[PDB]
């Protein structure tokens, strides 16, 4: 059923587009200045804040880049937003940029300070997918969460308590948790945890176990290809009418869109452009914990590890100066594409028979199997 699912999500994409365009028209930005992932970000956050303000806005004058610090009527923003979505709320839409931010953060940063202070092993990176993602996120917002993500929550919810309505949360938070697991025991053991009203160290210690079980017997976690507002704004402006032509977040749609995107980014004096593009690209598909081998395979070019990556973050801090600042064009194109999955595999070869698709292969017709016998460069982005 390609009617609701493909076209209803198109309608949520149209909203973000339309809105971004309107909002650019207010700031009186240029074309080059609307394609600046920097400005796009600021706008996206202005909105999520207002639906739950001001921000950094970079301008282009003869030669150099000027940063403007601006503020907007928190309600005006909310007004312009609905205008774009037909006076609807389109929580999906806000939630979408809620993820784009997530997926960018799960790749720009490593959240160790928090894992340990919770009592999780820092080496449990690959399980913290969406730890940044506000609880306000929707139902299809939590499905993107890693097993480890859930644990850090319950453990804190439990840790402060064990140190009214709060109960329905805990059970559900576990049901979700449990719905991540895809094996008998895994599934059953989650229940043995959900049994205690005041679950103390008994649970505290047990879930941590299950956290580690997922390192081997992974769960089902959905991945959503969520592109920056500018990319959708630009697309909408170019005529693409997604609600009518359909769109996906786990199909070929997102890759294809990024095959024509003209996104620019601010880049510090000593930073490596190629390295910058890589980052953004990995946030566009939630590939921050993917096997570097495969990421590079599909990417088309080396996908260098975080340590060897030359960049500190895409957003520009108030500390820095503009004099020594310039901007590059982000390389977001990829070689092939792949069905962003949810499954963690089980039996060691996973996704037996599943392959990669050419960017011409619109339909999921002919699959391609990668052979990794090769001089690779690692598997752990972190």
């Amino acid at each position: 059923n390609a009617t609701e699912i493909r076209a209803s999500v198109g309608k949520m994409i149209d909203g973000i587009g339309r809105f971004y365009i309107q909002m650019c028209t207010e700031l009186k930005l240029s074309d080059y200045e609307g394609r600046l992932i920097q400005n796009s970000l600021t706008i996206e956050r202005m909105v999520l804040s207002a639906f739950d303000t001001g921000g950094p806005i970079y301008r282009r004058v003869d030669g150099k880049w000027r940063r403007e610090l601006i503020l907007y009527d928190k309600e005006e923003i909310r007004r312009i937003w609905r205008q774009a979505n037909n006076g609807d709320d389109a929580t999906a839409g806000l939630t979408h940029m809620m993820i784009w931010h997530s997926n960018l953060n799960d790749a720009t940063y490593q959240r160790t300070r928090a894992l340990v202070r919770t009592g999780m092993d820092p080496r449990m990176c690959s399980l913290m997918q969406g730890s940044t993602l506000p609880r306000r996120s929707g139902a299809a917002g939590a499905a993107v969460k890693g097993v480890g993500t859930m644990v850090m929550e319950l453990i804190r919810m439990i840790k402060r308590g064990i140190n009214r309505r709060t109960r329905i949360a805990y059970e559900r938070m576990c049901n979700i948790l449990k719905g991540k697991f895809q094996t008998a025991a895994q599934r059953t053991m989650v229940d043995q945890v959900r049994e205690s009203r005041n679950p103390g160290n008994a649970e505290f210690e047990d879930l941590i176990f299950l956290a580690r079980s997922a390192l081997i017997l992974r769960g089902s976690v959905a991945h959503k290809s969520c592109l920056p507002a500018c990319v959708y704004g630009s697309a909408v402006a170019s005529g693409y009418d997604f609600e009518r032509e359909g769109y996906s977040l786990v199909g070929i749609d997102p890759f294809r869109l990024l095959q024509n995107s003209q996104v620019y980014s601010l880049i510090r004096p000593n930073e490596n452009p190629a390295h910058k593009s890589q980052l953004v690209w990995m946030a566009c598909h939630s590939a921050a914990f993917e096997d570097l081998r495969v990421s590079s395979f599909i990417r088309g070019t080396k996908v260098v590890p975080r340590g060897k990556l030359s960049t500190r973050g895409v957003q520009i801090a108030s500390n820095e100066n503009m004099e020594t600042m310039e901007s590059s064009t982000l390389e977001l194109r990829s070689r092939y594409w792949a069905i962003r999955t949810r499954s963690g595999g089980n039996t060691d070869v996973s996704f037996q028979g599943r392959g990669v698709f050419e960017l011409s292969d619109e339909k999921a017709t002919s699959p391609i199997v990668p052979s990794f016998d090769m001089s690779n460069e690692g598997s752990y982005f972190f």
């Binding site: 590939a287 999955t341 990668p370 990794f372």
Partner: peptide, 19 residues
């Protein structure tokens, strides 16, 4: 250490999953 130990899979392909 302080590094990764397993790979979270993002795509559907024939891939030995590292841990």
């Amino acid at each position: 250490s302080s590094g990764q130990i397993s790979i979270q899979p993002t795509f559907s392909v024939q891939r030995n999953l590292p841990f």
